[PDB]
PDB file of all heavy atoms in Angstrom:
ATOM      1  N   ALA A   1       0.834  -1.224  -0.012  1.00 17.81           N
ATOM      2  CA  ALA A   1       0.014  -0.003  -0.001  1.00 17.81           C
ATOM      3  C   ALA A   1       0.865   1.243  -0.007  1.00 17.81           C
ATOM      4  O   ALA A   1       0.448   2.300  -0.533  1.00 17.81           O
ATOM      5  CB  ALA A   1      -0.950   0.005   1.205  1.00 17.81           C
ATOM      6  N   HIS A   2       2.053   1.168   0.624  1.00 17.37           N
ATOM      7  CA  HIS A   2       2.991   2.275   0.605  1.00 17.37           C
ATOM      8  C   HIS A   2       3.807   2.349  -0.681  1.00 17.37           C
ATOM      9  O   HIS A   2       3.768   3.359  -1.351  1.00 17.37           O
ATOM     10  CB  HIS A   2       3.951   2.140   1.806  1.00 17.37           C
ATOM     11  CG  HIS A   2       3.290   2.371   3.118  1.00 17.37           C
ATOM     12  ND1 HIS A   2       2.577   1.363   3.795  1.00 17.37           N
ATOM     13  CD2 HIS A   2       3.199   3.465   3.897  1.00 17.37           C
ATOM     14  CE1 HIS A   2       2.133   1.823   4.922  1.00 17.37           C
ATOM     15  NE2 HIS A   2       2.484   3.115   5.023  1.00 17.37           N
ATOM     16  N   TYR A   3       4.554   1.306  -1.015  1.00 17.08           N
ATOM     17  CA  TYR A   3       5.380   1.305  -2.205  1.00 17.08           C
ATOM     18  C   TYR A   3       4.590   1.722  -3.459  1.00 17.08           C
ATOM     19  O   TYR A   3       5.038   2.547  -4.246  1.00 17.08           O
ATOM     20  CB  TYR A   3       6.023  -0.090  -2.414  1.00 17.08           C
ATOM     21  CG  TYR A   3       6.798  -0.222  -3.698  1.00 17.08           C
ATOM     22  CD1 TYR A   3       8.060   0.392  -3.831  1.00 17.08           C
ATOM     23  CD2 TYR A   3       6.320  -0.982  -4.725  1.00 17.08           C
ATOM     24  CE1 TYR A   3       8.773   0.257  -5.010  1.00 17.08           C
ATOM     25  CE2 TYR A   3       7.057  -1.139  -5.902  1.00 17.08           C
ATOM     26  CZ  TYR A   3       8.269  -0.527  -6.017  1.00 17.08           C
ATOM     27  OH  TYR A   3       8.994  -0.638  -7.192  1.00 17.08           O
ATOM     28  N   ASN A   4       3.390   1.173  -3.619  1.00 18.43           N
ATOM     29  CA  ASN A   4       2.524   1.573  -4.719  1.00 18.43           C
ATOM     30  C   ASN A   4       2.182   3.058  -4.641  1.00 18.43           C
ATOM     31  O   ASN A   4       2.146   3.734  -5.629  1.00 18.43           O
ATOM     32  CB  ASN A   4       1.272   0.735  -4.748  1.00 18.43           C
ATOM     33  CG  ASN A   4       1.523  -0.721  -5.044  1.00 18.43           C
ATOM     34  OD1 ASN A   4       1.038  -1.623  -4.364  1.00 18.43           O
ATOM     35  ND2 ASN A   4       2.351  -0.987  -6.074  1.00 18.43           N
ATOM     36  N   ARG A   5       1.926   3.539  -3.425  1.00 18.61           N
ATOM     37  CA  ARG A   5       1.633   4.964  -3.241  1.00 18.61           C
ATOM     38  C   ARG A   5       2.819   5.826  -3.716  1.00 18.61           C
ATOM     39  O   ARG A   5       2.608   6.843  -4.370  1.00 18.61           O
ATOM     40  CB  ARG A   5       1.336   5.269  -1.789  1.00 18.61           C
ATOM     41  CG  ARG A   5       1.069   6.731  -1.464  1.00 18.61           C
ATOM     42  CD  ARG A   5      -0.187   7.215  -2.164  1.00 18.61           C
ATOM     43  NE  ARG A   5      -0.498   8.583  -1.773  1.00 18.61           N
ATOM     44  CZ  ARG A   5      -1.393   9.337  -2.399  1.00 18.61           C
ATOM     45  NH1 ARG A   5      -2.094   8.886  -3.439  1.00 18.61           N
ATOM     46  NH2 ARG A   5      -1.636  10.572  -1.986  1.00 18.61           N
ATOM     47  N   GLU A   6       4.041   5.429  -3.378  1.00 17.14           N
ATOM     48  CA  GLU A   6       5.195   6.150  -3.868  1.00 17.14           C
ATOM     49  C   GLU A   6       5.304   6.089  -5.379  1.00 17.14           C
ATOM     50  O   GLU A   6       5.662   7.058  -6.022  1.00 17.14           O
ATOM     51  CB  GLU A   6       6.479   5.578  -3.208  1.00 17.14           C
ATOM     52  CG  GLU A   6       7.758   6.303  -3.612  1.00 17.14           C
ATOM     53  CD  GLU A   6       7.818   7.732  -3.079  1.00 17.14           C
ATOM     54  OE1 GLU A   6       7.005   8.072  -2.182  1.00 17.14           O
ATOM     55  OE2 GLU A   6       8.675   8.490  -3.543  1.00 17.14           O
ATOM     56  N   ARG A   7       4.964   4.934  -5.960  1.00 15.80           N
ATOM     57  CA  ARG A   7       4.959   4.833  -7.417  1.00 15.80           C
ATOM     58  C   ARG A   7       3.898   5.760  -8.018  1.00 15.80           C
ATOM     59  O   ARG A   7       4.006   6.194  -9.169  1.00 15.80           O
ATOM     60  CB  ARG A   7       4.703   3.387  -7.859  1.00 15.80           C
ATOM     61  CG  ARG A   7       5.820   2.436  -7.556  1.00 15.80           C
ATOM     62  CD  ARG A   7       5.486   1.038  -7.978  1.00 15.80           C
ATOM     63  NE  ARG A   7       5.292   0.971  -9.433  1.00 15.80           N
ATOM     64  CZ  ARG A   7       6.297   0.804 -10.302  1.00 15.80           C
ATOM     65  NH1 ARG A   7       7.556   0.705  -9.847  1.00 15.80           N
ATOM     66  NH2 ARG A   7       6.054   0.735 -11.601  1.00 15.80           N
ATOM     67  N   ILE A   8       2.827   6.057  -7.262  1.00 14.23           N
ATOM     68  CA  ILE A   8       1.801   6.962  -7.762  1.00 14.23           C
ATOM     69  C   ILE A   8       2.247   8.410  -7.650  1.00 14.23           C
ATOM     70  O   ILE A   8       2.005   9.214  -8.566  1.00 14.23           O
ATOM     71  CB  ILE A   8       0.479   6.696  -7.009  1.00 14.23           C
ATOM     72  CG1 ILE A   8      -0.048   5.319  -7.337  1.00 14.23           C
ATOM     73  CG2 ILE A   8      -0.547   7.765  -7.415  1.00 14.23           C
ATOM     74  CD1 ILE A   8      -1.194   4.875  -6.456  1.00 14.23           C
ATOM     75  N   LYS A   9       2.922   8.754  -6.551  1.00 12.69           N
ATOM     76  CA  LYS A   9       3.477  10.093  -6.422  1.00 12.69           C
ATOM     77  C   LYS A   9       4.533  10.322  -7.520  1.00 12.69           C
ATOM     78  O   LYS A   9       4.659  11.454  -7.999  1.00 12.69           O
ATOM     79  CB  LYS A   9       4.084  10.301  -5.049  1.00 12.69           C
ATOM     80  CG  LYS A   9       3.063  10.307  -3.914  1.00 12.69           C
ATOM     81  CD  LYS A   9       3.773  10.440  -2.552  1.00 12.69           C
ATOM     82  CE  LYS A   9       2.743  10.447  -1.443  1.00 12.69           C
ATOM     83  NZ  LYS A   9       3.413  10.517  -0.083  1.00 12.69           N
ATOM     84  N   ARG A  10       5.267   9.292  -7.867  1.00 11.96           N
ATOM     85  CA  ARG A  10       6.251   9.402  -8.947  1.00 11.96           C
ATOM     86  C   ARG A  10       5.574   9.494 -10.303  1.00 11.96           C
ATOM     87  O   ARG A  10       5.990  10.244 -11.191  1.00 11.96           O
ATOM     88  CB  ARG A  10       7.218   8.260  -8.902  1.00 11.96           C
ATOM     89  CG  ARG A  10       8.290   8.280  -9.988  1.00 11.96           C
ATOM     90  CD  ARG A  10       9.166   7.045  -9.884  1.00 11.96           C
ATOM     91  NE  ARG A  10       9.928   7.018  -8.660  1.00 11.96           N
ATOM     92  CZ  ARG A  10      10.751   6.044  -8.260  1.00 11.96           C
ATOM     93  NH1 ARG A  10      10.888   4.968  -9.060  1.00 11.96           N
ATOM     94  NH2 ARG A  10      11.404   6.091  -7.143  1.00 11.96           N
ATOM     95  N   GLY A  11       4.482   8.691 -10.508  1.00 13.84           N
ATOM     96  CA  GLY A  11       3.811   8.634 -11.774  1.00 13.84           C
ATOM     97  C   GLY A  11       4.454   7.770 -12.820  1.00 13.84           C
ATOM     98  O   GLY A  11       4.310   8.060 -14.024  1.00 13.84           O
ATOM     99  N   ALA A  12       5.120   6.690 -12.371  1.00 12.27           N
ATOM    100  CA  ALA A  12       5.839   5.837 -13.356  1.00 12.27           C
ATOM    101  C   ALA A  12       4.890   4.847 -13.994  1.00 12.27           C
ATOM    102  O   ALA A  12       4.520   5.005 -15.183  1.00 12.27           O
ATOM    103  CB  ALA A  12       6.970   5.118 -12.669  1.00 12.27           C
ATOM    104  N   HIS A  13       4.465   3.815 -13.265  1.00 13.90           N
ATOM    105  CA  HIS A  13       3.522   2.825 -13.815  1.00 13.90           C
ATOM    106  C   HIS A  13       2.478   2.566 -12.746  1.00 13.90           C
ATOM    107  O   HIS A  13       2.811   2.184 -11.624  1.00 13.90           O
ATOM    108  CB  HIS A  13       4.274   1.566 -14.194  1.00 13.90           C
ATOM    109  CG  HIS A  13       5.330   1.760 -15.264  1.00 13.90           C
ATOM    110  ND1 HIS A  13       5.000   2.027 -16.564  1.00 13.90           N
ATOM    111  CD2 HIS A  13       6.668   1.700 -15.198  1.00 13.90           C
ATOM    112  CE1 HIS A  13       6.107   2.160 -17.250  1.00 13.90           C
ATOM    113  NE2 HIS A  13       7.124   1.955 -16.454  1.00 13.90           N
ATOM    114  N   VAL A  14       1.205   2.777 -13.122  1.00 14.81           N
ATOM    115  CA  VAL A  14       0.085   2.535 -12.211  1.00 14.81           C
ATOM    116  C   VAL A  14      -1.115   2.112 -13.033  1.00 14.81           C
ATOM    117  O   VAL A  14      -1.318   2.543 -14.168  1.00 14.81           O
ATOM    118  CB  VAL A  14      -0.239   3.826 -11.386  1.00 14.81           C
ATOM    119  CG1 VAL A  14      -0.685   4.961 -12.270  1.00 14.81           C
ATOM    120  CG2 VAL A  14      -1.290   3.507 -10.337  1.00 14.81           C
ATOM    121  N   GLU A  15      -1.917   1.214 -12.446  1.00 15.03           N
ATOM    122  CA  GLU A  15      -3.065   0.634 -13.107  1.00 15.03           C
ATOM    123  C   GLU A  15      -4.341   1.275 -12.562  1.00 15.03           C
ATOM    124  O   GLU A  15      -4.406   1.636 -11.400  1.00 15.03           O
ATOM    125  CB  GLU A  15      -3.090  -0.879 -12.921  1.00 15.03           C
ATOM    126  CG  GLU A  15      -4.148  -1.639 -13.664  1.00 15.03           C
ATOM    127  CD  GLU A  15      -5.485  -1.606 -12.961  1.00 15.03           C
ATOM    128  OE1 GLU A  15      -5.461  -1.415 -11.753  1.00 15.03           O
ATOM    129  OE2 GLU A  15      -6.550  -1.784 -13.628  1.00 15.03           O
ATOM    130  N   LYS A  16      -5.308   1.447 -13.462  1.00 17.25           N
ATOM    131  CA  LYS A  16      -6.442   2.338 -13.209  1.00 17.25           C
ATOM    132  C   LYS A  16      -7.217   1.933 -11.949  1.00 17.25           C
ATOM    133  O   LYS A  16      -7.648   2.812 -11.193  1.00 17.25           O
ATOM    134  CB  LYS A  16      -7.392   2.396 -14.409  1.00 17.25           C
ATOM    135  CG  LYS A  16      -6.787   3.077 -15.620  1.00 17.25           C
ATOM    136  CD  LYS A  16      -7.760   3.063 -16.807  1.00 17.25           C
ATOM    137  CE  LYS A  16      -7.147   3.784 -17.987  1.00 17.25           C
ATOM    138  NZ  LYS A  16      -8.071   3.759 -19.176  1.00 17.25           N
ATOM    139  N   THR A  17      -7.453   0.656 -11.752  1.00 14.70           N
ATOM    140  CA  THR A  17      -8.087   0.253 -10.501  1.00 14.70           C
ATOM    141  C   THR A  17      -7.072  -0.120  -9.408  1.00 14.70           C
ATOM    142  O   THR A  17      -7.453  -0.321  -8.265  1.00 14.70           O
ATOM    143  CB  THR A  17      -9.041  -0.925 -10.724  1.00 14.70           C
ATOM    144  OG1 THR A  17      -9.849  -1.145  -9.550  1.00 14.70           O
ATOM    145  CG2 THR A  17      -8.288  -2.217 -11.005  1.00 14.70           C
ATOM    146  N   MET A  18      -5.775  -0.189  -9.775  1.00 14.22           N
ATOM    147  CA  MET A  18      -4.784  -0.383  -8.735  1.00 14.22           C
ATOM    148  C   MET A  18      -4.620   0.873  -7.908  1.00 14.22           C
ATOM    149  O   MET A  18      -4.353   0.782  -6.696  1.00 14.22           O
ATOM    150  CB  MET A  18      -3.427  -0.760  -9.404  1.00 14.22           C
ATOM    151  CG  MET A  18      -2.303  -1.034  -8.395  1.00 14.22           C
ATOM    152  SD  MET A  18      -2.656  -2.482  -7.369  1.00 14.22           S
ATOM    153  CE  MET A  18      -2.390  -3.800  -8.581  1.00 14.22           C
ATOM    154  N   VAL A  19      -4.740   2.052  -8.512  1.00 14.69           N
ATOM    155  CA  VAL A  19      -4.718   3.270  -7.736  1.00 14.69           C
ATOM    156  C   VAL A  19      -5.931   3.381  -6.823  1.00 14.69           C
ATOM    157  O   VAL A  19      -5.883   3.963  -5.729  1.00 14.69           O
ATOM    158  CB  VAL A  19      -4.563   4.522  -8.666  1.00 14.69           C
ATOM    159  CG1 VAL A  19      -5.780   4.661  -9.534  1.00 14.69           C
ATOM    160  CG2 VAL A  19      -4.375   5.799  -7.868  1.00 14.69           C
ATOM    161  N   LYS A  20      -7.055   2.799  -7.266  1.00 15.80           N
ATOM    162  CA  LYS A  20      -8.265   2.842  -6.454  1.00 15.80           C
ATOM    163  C   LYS A  20      -8.153   1.875  -5.273  1.00 15.80           C
ATOM    164  O   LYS A  20      -8.458   2.265  -4.137  1.00 15.80           O
ATOM    165  CB  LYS A  20      -9.471   2.493  -7.343  1.00 15.80           C
ATOM    166  CG  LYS A  20     -10.792   2.566  -6.573  1.00 15.80           C
ATOM    167  CD  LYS A  20     -11.947   2.257  -7.510  1.00 15.80           C
ATOM    168  CE  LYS A  20     -13.289   2.310  -6.761  1.00 15.80           C
ATOM    169  NZ  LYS A  20     -14.445   2.009  -7.700  1.00 15.80           N
ATOM    170  N   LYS A  21      -7.743   0.639  -5.536  1.00 17.45           N
ATOM    171  CA  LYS A  21      -7.528  -0.289  -4.442  1.00 17.45           C
ATOM    172  C   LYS A  21      -6.451   0.208  -3.496  1.00 17.45           C
ATOM    173  O   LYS A  21      -6.509  -0.058  -2.297  1.00 17.45           O
ATOM    174  CB  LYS A  21      -7.161  -1.670  -5.007  1.00 17.45           C
ATOM    175  CG  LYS A  21      -8.208  -2.294  -5.913  1.00 17.45           C
ATOM    176  CD  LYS A  21      -9.535  -2.457  -5.228  1.00 17.45           C
ATOM    177  CE  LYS A  21      -9.496  -3.608  -4.239  1.00 17.45           C
ATOM    178  NZ  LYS A  21     -10.845  -3.847  -3.654  1.00 17.45           N
ATOM    179  N   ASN A  22      -5.470   0.938  -3.995  1.00 18.45           N
ATOM    180  CA  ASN A  22      -4.477   1.534  -3.141  1.00 18.45           C
ATOM    181  C   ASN A  22      -5.083   2.647  -2.307  1.00 18.45           C
ATOM    182  O   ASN A  22      -4.732   2.824  -1.141  1.00 18.45           O
ATOM    183  CB  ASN A  22      -3.285   2.071  -3.960  1.00 18.45           C
ATOM    184  CG  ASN A  22      -2.099   2.437  -3.089  1.00 18.45           C
ATOM    185  OD1 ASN A  22      -1.893   1.858  -2.053  1.00 18.45           O
ATOM    186  ND2 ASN A  22      -1.333   3.418  -3.544  1.00 18.45           N
ATOM    187  N   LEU A  23      -5.979   3.439  -2.900  1.00 14.27           N
ATOM    188  CA  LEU A  23      -6.733   4.416  -2.109  1.00 14.27           C
ATOM    189  C   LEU A  23      -7.465   3.742  -0.951  1.00 14.27           C
ATOM    190  O   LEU A  23      -7.418   4.238   0.178  1.00 14.27           O
ATOM    191  CB  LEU A  23      -7.740   5.142  -3.027  1.00 14.27           C
ATOM    192  CG  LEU A  23      -8.528   6.349  -2.463  1.00 14.27           C
ATOM    193  CD1 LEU A  23      -8.899   7.257  -3.613  1.00 14.27           C
ATOM    194  CD2 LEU A  23      -9.782   5.907  -1.718  1.00 14.27           C
ATOM    195  N   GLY A  24      -8.133   2.639  -1.236  1.00 11.83           N
ATOM    196  CA  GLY A  24      -8.845   1.920  -0.172  1.00 11.83           C
ATOM    197  C   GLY A  24      -7.968   1.357   0.917  1.00 11.83           C
ATOM    198  O   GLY A  24      -8.220   1.574   2.085  1.00 11.83           O
ATOM    199  N   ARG A  25      -6.915   0.637   0.504  1.00 13.51           N
ATOM    200  CA  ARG A  25      -6.033  -0.005   1.465  1.00 13.51           C
ATOM    201  C   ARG A  25      -5.292   1.047   2.312  1.00 13.51           C
ATOM    202  O   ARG A  25      -5.319   0.997   3.539  1.00 13.51           O
ATOM    203  CB  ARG A  25      -5.042  -0.902   0.725  1.00 13.51           C
ATOM    204  CG  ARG A  25      -5.694  -1.997  -0.041  1.00 13.51           C
ATOM    205  CD  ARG A  25      -4.692  -2.908  -0.779  1.00 13.51           C
ATOM    206  NE  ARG A  25      -5.375  -3.885  -1.618  1.00 13.51           N
ATOM    207  CZ  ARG A  25      -5.866  -5.019  -1.156  1.00 13.51           C
ATOM    208  NH1 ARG A  25      -5.760  -5.336   0.123  1.00 13.51           N
ATOM    209  NH2 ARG A  25      -6.471  -5.866  -1.986  1.00 13.51           N
ATOM    210  N   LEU A  26      -4.665   2.016   1.649  1.00 14.66           N
ATOM    211  CA  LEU A  26      -3.947   3.064   2.354  1.00 14.66           C
ATOM    212  C   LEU A  26      -4.918   3.839   3.243  1.00 14.66           C
ATOM    213  O   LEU A  26      -4.523   4.280   4.329  1.00 14.66           O
ATOM    214  CB  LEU A  26      -3.235   3.979   1.360  1.00 14.66           C
ATOM    215  CG  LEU A  26      -2.227   4.984   1.927  1.00 14.66           C
ATOM    216  CD1 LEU A  26      -1.112   5.173   0.904  1.00 14.66           C
ATOM    217  CD2 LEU A  26      -2.875   6.306   2.212  1.00 14.66           C
ATOM    218  N   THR A  27      -6.153   4.005   2.792  1.00 15.43           N
ATOM    219  CA  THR A  27      -7.192   4.580   3.623  1.00 15.43           C
ATOM    220  C   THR A  27      -7.352   3.767   4.916  1.00 15.43           C
ATOM    221  O   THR A  27      -7.296   4.329   6.008  1.00 15.43           O
ATOM    222  CB  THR A  27      -8.520   4.645   2.878  1.00 15.43           C
ATOM    223  OG1 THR A  27      -8.436   5.604   1.813  1.00 15.43           O
ATOM    224  CG2 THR A  27      -9.637   4.976   3.830  1.00 15.43           C
ATOM    225  N   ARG A  28      -7.573   2.470   4.785  1.00 14.38           N
ATOM    226  CA  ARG A  28      -7.901   1.656   5.944  1.00 14.38           C
ATOM    227  C   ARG A  28      -6.756   1.631   6.925  1.00 14.38           C
ATOM    228  O   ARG A  28      -6.940   1.613   8.170  1.00 14.38           O
ATOM    229  CB  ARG A  28      -8.284   0.230   5.508  1.00 14.38           C
ATOM    230  CG  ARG A  28      -9.533   0.217   4.630  1.00 14.38           C
ATOM    231  CD  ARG A  28      -9.907  -1.187   4.226  1.00 14.38           C
ATOM    232  NE  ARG A  28     -10.371  -1.953   5.367  1.00 14.38           N
ATOM    233  CZ  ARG A  28     -11.646  -1.957   5.790  1.00 14.38           C
ATOM    234  NH1 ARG A  28     -12.540  -1.252   5.132  1.00 14.38           N
ATOM    235  NH2 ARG A  28     -11.986  -2.656   6.854  1.00 14.38           N
ATOM    236  N   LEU A  29      -5.506   1.637   6.435  1.00 14.24           N
ATOM    237  CA  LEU A  29      -4.341   1.700   7.345  1.00 14.24           C
ATOM    238  C   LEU A  29      -4.232   3.079   7.959  1.00 14.24           C
ATOM    239  O   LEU A  29      -3.710   3.218   9.075  1.00 14.24           O
ATOM    240  CB  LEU A  29      -3.074   1.282   6.628  1.00 14.24           C
ATOM    241  CG  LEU A  29      -2.497   2.071   5.435  1.00 14.24           C
ATOM    242  CD1 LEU A  29      -1.702   3.299   5.877  1.00 14.24           C
ATOM    243  CD2 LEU A  29      -1.642   1.156   4.586  1.00 14.24           C
ATOM    244  N   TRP A  30      -4.660   4.117   7.250  1.00 14.81           N
ATOM    245  CA  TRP A  30      -4.613   5.465   7.816  1.00 14.81           C
ATOM    246  C   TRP A  30      -5.616   5.617   8.947  1.00 14.81           C
ATOM    247  O   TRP A  30      -5.301   6.189  10.012  1.00 14.81           O
ATOM    248  CB  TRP A  30      -4.868   6.512   6.745  1.00 14.81           C
ATOM    249  CG  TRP A  30      -4.713   7.922   7.213  1.00 14.81           C
ATOM    250  CD1 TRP A  30      -3.557   8.623   7.301  1.00 14.81           C
ATOM    251  CD2 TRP A  30      -5.764   8.800   7.693  1.00 14.81           C
ATOM    252  NE1 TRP A  30      -3.814   9.882   7.788  1.00 14.81           N
ATOM    253  CE2 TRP A  30      -5.145  10.016   8.014  1.00 14.81           C
ATOM    254  CE3 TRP A  30      -7.137   8.652   7.826  1.00 14.81           C
ATOM    255  CZ2 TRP A  30      -5.890  11.086   8.528  1.00 14.81           C
ATOM    256  CZ3 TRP A  30      -7.841   9.710   8.314  1.00 14.81           C
ATOM    257  CH2 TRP A  30      -7.231  10.908   8.667  1.00 14.81           C
ATOM    258  N   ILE A  31      -6.822   5.106   8.756  1.00 12.96           N
ATOM    259  CA  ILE A  31      -7.836   5.088   9.830  1.00 12.96           C
ATOM    260  C   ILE A  31      -7.328   4.246  11.001  1.00 12.96           C
ATOM    261  O   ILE A  31      -7.534   4.575  12.175  1.00 12.96           O
ATOM    262  CB  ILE A  31      -9.190   4.560   9.323  1.00 12.96           C
ATOM    263  CG1 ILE A  31      -9.645   5.350   8.084  1.00 12.96           C
ATOM    264  CG2 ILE A  31     -10.215   4.665  10.391  1.00 12.96           C
ATOM    265  CD1 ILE A  31      -9.881   6.798   8.324  1.00 12.96           C
ATOM    266  N   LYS A  32      -6.701   3.110  10.660  1.00 13.22           N
ATOM    267  CA  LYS A  32      -6.153   2.261  11.717  1.00 13.22           C
ATOM    268  C   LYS A  32      -5.106   2.993  12.538  1.00 13.22           C
ATOM    269  O   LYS A  32      -5.115   2.931  13.768  1.00 13.22           O
ATOM    270  CB  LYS A  32      -5.533   0.999  11.066  1.00 13.22           C
ATOM    271  CG  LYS A  32      -4.956   0.014  12.042  1.00 13.22           C
ATOM    272  CD  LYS A  32      -4.399  -1.201  11.345  1.00 13.22           C
ATOM    273  CE  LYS A  32      -3.802  -2.219  12.330  1.00 13.22           C
ATOM    274  NZ  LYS A  32      -3.273  -3.444  11.631  1.00 13.22           N
ATOM    275  N   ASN A  33      -4.215   3.715  11.875  1.00 12.45           N
ATOM    276  CA  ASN A  33      -3.201   4.502  12.593  1.00 12.45           C
ATOM    277  C   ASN A  33      -3.868   5.613  13.414  1.00 12.45           C
ATOM    278  O   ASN A  33      -3.444   5.894  14.565  1.00 12.45           O
ATOM    279  CB  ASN A  33      -2.212   5.111  11.609  1.00 12.45           C
ATOM    280  CG  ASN A  33      -1.291   4.072  11.001  1.00 12.45           C
ATOM    281  OD1 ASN A  33      -1.071   2.998  11.569  1.00 12.45           O
ATOM    282  ND2 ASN A  33      -0.719   4.390   9.834  1.00 12.45           N
TER     283      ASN A  33
END
């Protein structure tokens, strides 16, 4: 959820629903924190 997030901030290679699932996962860990 992190490494993919960094790949999204970089903008190298990301898949259209992979950024969405990453939104969800990183969300849930953010609420958890």
Side-chain angles (χ1 to χ4, degrees):
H2 292 83
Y3 175 73
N4 295 132
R5 179 64 176 168
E6 182 67 15
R7 292 179 64 84
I8 294 169
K9 293 177 180 178
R10 180 183 295 176
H13 299 290
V14 63
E15 186 277 337
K16 292 179 179 178
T17 191
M18 182 65 73
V19 63
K20 183 178 179 180
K21 300 301 286 186
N22 192 30
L23 188 153
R25 299 180 185 277
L26 191 147
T27 292
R28 298 181 69 87
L29 63 81
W30 184 86
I31 307 298
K32 182 179 180 179
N33 289 337

